[PDB]
Symmetry: D2
Subunit: 122 residues, 4 copies
């Protein structure tokens, strides 16, 4: 199969994201609803934007996107690869950086968390 | 007041441009890297991202994705735009560079991480 | 009561042993990886690290370094030991694999990052 | 020159660390005094332990170490390479993960920060 980004996905936390169509330059838009937050705020649905790499028209492309959170001053980016898994299902295997806002450039050292996120189609 | 729009460089000698940021915090840009993990000839590549506009912070967070035109890889960057008394700006960012692998059993080795600090041209 | 001492495995089928932990929180262990970024034959390698004992938490953080015997690389792991209802343990860790580069100009590409979840074997 | 880990180092935060002799199995011990913390706690000098890789006895070895902080429940690991810089000085280029203690497994996702640290002698 070719692995496509377009569709509704979910992860183990129960966070969901929807990615729209991917255009000829590899650009896509979507929305992300996170299950969990580092804020003390009400979570809202937040937009994301990114690109899939189309060099050599790989069936399992890499891609990246940015989630522009609407209830926090933070930003997360994700990057990964759209695989066909051993069981034939599409899966997105990604890593992320969550950048918090700090007040002072001397506090920049602690502003970035890292992690993984694995998505399956919902 | 710290704006991402401009031409930027880092110590590695890579440059990036970022254009205007629209009311939804979106922007497009270009990135010309001085270095590569590929043995391919480097080409200028496009980037796209967003600046966070919650509470209209003067030192906003942001992220963008670089869609490399000479490899199968993708890099994302996230960071913050810092600006001092004299209006001098610095973007402090961290990145993940995702390589393509052929088999999902090699996924574990596919992601590099590092920092990039940009200043204006 | 989440203890690191034991034999552990991950989904790649790598295994690790960790022996007794000191009153100083030091431990020694071994790692036999299922996968390598090198083209060399894998060999069992030693590891050394510490568990944090502050407030003697039941679910302590810890870190350790694996000194690979078949490559010029080093990997460090850091995480937390979680234990459930039935006394079932899982170590959730993240790791940086540092490759050797010959020239300092190539340092930017030398560090890979990932996760590893271990269960008792 | 061969790049040696043993000695007293500092970074741009003003954090200092002292590494002792490296033994024949590549092991070393030291102490770390951080300038900053992500906690609301009082900082104290803390021990570190790690190893240098001695495969092919490279003059610029990789290494890793763990700082077992004595004033928080956190752990940081650092890994990197001891280079001789273009100017002939020793420099340790490292990256780190700082693992915070979370109370529950559901919150694991947010417990790891990442960053760089570059050290120079004295
Ligand atoms: O707090 C803010 O400032 C804004 C909101 C940030 C939400 C973060 S983005 C990374 C993480 C969180 N949500 C999510 O789905 N993540 C994620 O890592 O999911 C994958 C996962 C699955 C199972 C277990 C752990 C992580
Ligand atoms: O090879 C591929 O597959 C595609 C090309 C990947 C290019 C990588 S993206 C991160 C790194 C490299 N270029 C660059 O400017 N980076 C960077 O880290 O420079 C940042 C820097 C900032 C401040 C000081 C020193 C270096
Ligand atoms: O090549 C070298 O230079 C020296 C050897 C490096 C081995 C690396 S250390 C991190 C990674 C690899 N082995 C392992 O068990 N890891 C690991 O990530 O396992 C966790 C895992 C579990 C399921 C799926 C993917 C990863
Ligand atoms: O808080 C806790 O939970 C326990 C203590 C953690 C101390 C952290 S470990 C990584 C970081 C901090 N200190 C330090 O020297 N680091 C560091 O990154 O310094 C390098 C640096 C130099 C200049 C600018 C930014 C970073
Ligand atoms: C994910 O979508 C599923 C099914 O539609 C829903 O039950 C779940 O609550 C959603 N997660 C969030 C964070 O909204
Ligand atoms: C960045 O711009 C400078 C000055 O214009 C130029 O000399 C340098 O070659 C550019 N860097 C790259 C990687 O093209
Ligand atoms: C892990 O241990 C099992 C035996 O328990 C063994 O079959 C497997 O080969 C080990 N993995 C490696 C990489 O040695
Ligand atoms: C670093 O060492 C210097 C003495 O050379 C000292 O002034 C400074 O406060 C030390 N840093 C810390 C965090 O104690």
């Amino acid at each position: 199969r070719k692995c496509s980004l377009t569709g509704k996905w979910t992860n183990d936390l129960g966070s969901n994201m929807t990615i729209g169509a991917v255009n000829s330059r590899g650009e896509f838009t979507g929305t992300y609803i996170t299950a969990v937050t580092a804020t003390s705020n009400e979570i809202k649905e937040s937009p994301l934007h990114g690109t899939q790499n189309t060099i050599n028209k790989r069936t399992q492309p890499t891609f990246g996107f940015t989630v522009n959170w609407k209830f926090s001053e933070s930003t997360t980016v994700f990057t990964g690869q759209c695989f066909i898994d051993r069981n034939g299902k599409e899966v997105l295997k990604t890593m992320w950086l969550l950048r918090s806002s700090v007040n002072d450039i001397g506090d920049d050292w602690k502003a970035t968390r890292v992690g993984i996120n694995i998505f399956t189609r919902l």
